């Protein structure tokens, strides 16, 4: 159907610049406007501006002139948004959207995450968390990594029900998160339960078996 494909996640150091893309497919691209929207961590939506297939037949939210530059490539039906001299205030997920015929943002991109930080790519230290009784709860502590995100699974996905993975928190410029899994006491330590943590950015993946003791 009408689709907009946005570029992948970006990590950029303060003062640097980045250019995000939104490719349209399933339509005449130049017949509709492409809008850009910003959403900071845990906050609301902000309109940045729009472009109407003319690298500078644009309109911006005053706040974003001097931060964002919108351009378009009709030869590939792609909209671009360049953000300059980034600061931590620029860390957010950026969405592109088409201003449809009924005049509302009718089709949206999946969003591109931008993280502005001078932190270094660091793999997480993964620690097993062992317990006590009937439906038993076990855990996995994923500490000190950068950047987001990490993917946590239990028994390679065999255990999906009863799994809770908490949002990461940032401390000392590194992320930390935990995941818990609950199982019948007749399952563990009777059988093996392991947490698998993948961290794409550092190309690492670790398996930590939950063993008895505390």
């Amino acid at each position: 159907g009408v689709k907009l494909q946005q570029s992948g996640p970006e990590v950029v150091k303060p003062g640097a610049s980045v250019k995000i893309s939104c490719k349209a497919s399933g339509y005449s691209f130049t017949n509709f406007y492409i809008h850009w929207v910003k959403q900071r961590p845990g906050q609301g939506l902000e309109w940045i501006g729009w472009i109407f297939h003319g690298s500078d037949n644009t309109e911006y939210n005053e706040k974003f002139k001097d931060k964002a530059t919108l351009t378009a490539d009709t030869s590939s039906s792609t909209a671009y948004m360049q953000l300059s001299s980034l600061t931590s205030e620029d860390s957010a997920v950026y969405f592109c959207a088409r201003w449809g015929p009924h005049w509302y943002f009718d089709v949206w991109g999946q969003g591109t995450t931008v993280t502005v930080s001078s932190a270094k790519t660091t793999p997480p230290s993964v620690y097993p968390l062992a317990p006590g009784n009937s439906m038993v709860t076990l855990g996995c502590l994923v500490k000190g990594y950068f950047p987001e995100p990490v993917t946590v699974t239990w028994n390679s996905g065999s255990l999906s029900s009863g799994v809770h993975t908490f949002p990461a928190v940032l401390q000392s410029d590194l992320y930390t998160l935990s995941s818990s899994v609950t199982v019948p006491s007749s399952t563990w330590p009777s059988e093996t339960v392991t947490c698998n943590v993948a961290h794409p950015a550092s190309s690492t993946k670790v398996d930590k078996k939950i063993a008895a003791a505390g």
């Binding site: 309109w47 943002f105 230290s125 620690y127 968390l129 062992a130 993975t165 908490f166 930390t176």
Partner: protein, 212 residues
């Protein structure tokens, strides 16, 4: 300079219940749009030009209003309607309201508290983190208190929370106390206390550095 204020900030409704949220414009506006966003996903067009339903939106939804006040109503609340709803000015500067969080109401549920001592693996590397999970409870409201050898501790504590589990509609929370091997080895008793409405008495879980 039109400001859009949405009310209420957060609200919960039982399944089959009628719900209405509002968006107030500091000044008059001709049309208002509404979007629905669920954690980890992009906003989806919901209502446009005040009362028109966007594609993919069930008939139980409706919109009304004019001038400075608009509303979005759900004739009968359903689990899948739990989300954040944003109103948006129809023309430049295309300003959005701060959003309203709609949650699905369910029967109260005390949390299942679990406390975990630092792993041997982390200890052998010189670190020490104590973790507590407060799982599957209902009314998001909950307070966690850590106690080391009886004394309450306020810092070095990081908390995180999950949204309503689309299965049981409960919330969960983790609390982590981080320390150096020495800070942890100096004390013996570690306690995680949860205070939830479903209990007049706080739920306590503990362990002794040595024994437990």
């Amino acid at each position: 300079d039109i400001v859009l204020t949405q009310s209420p900030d957060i609200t919960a409704a039982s399944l089959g219940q009628k719900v209405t949220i509002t968006c107030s414009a500091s000044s008059s506006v001709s049309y208002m749009h509404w979007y629905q966003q669920k954690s980890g996903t992009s906003p989806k067009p919901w209502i446009f030009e005040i009362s028109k339903l966007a594609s993919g939106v069930p008939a139980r939804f409706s919109g009304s209003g004019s001038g400075t006040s608009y509303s979005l109503t759900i004739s009968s609340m359903e689990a899948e309607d739990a989300a954040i709803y944003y109103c948006q000015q129809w023309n430049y500067p295309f300003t959005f309201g701060g959003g309203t969080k709609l949650e699905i109401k369910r029967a109260d549920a005390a949390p299942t508290v679990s406390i975990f001592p630092p792993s041997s693996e982390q200890l052998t590397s010189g670190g020490a983190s104590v973790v507590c999970f407060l799982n599957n409870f209902y009314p998001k409201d909950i307070n966690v208190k850590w106690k080391i050898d009886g004394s309450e501790r306020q810092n070095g504590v990081l908390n995180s929370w999950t949204d309503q589990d689309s299965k049981d509609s409960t919330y969960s929370m983790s609390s982590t106390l981080t320390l150096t091997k020495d800070e942890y080895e100096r004390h013996n008793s570690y306690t995680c206390e949860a205070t939830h409405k479903t209990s007049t008495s706080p739920i306590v879980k503990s362990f002794n550095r040595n024994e437990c």
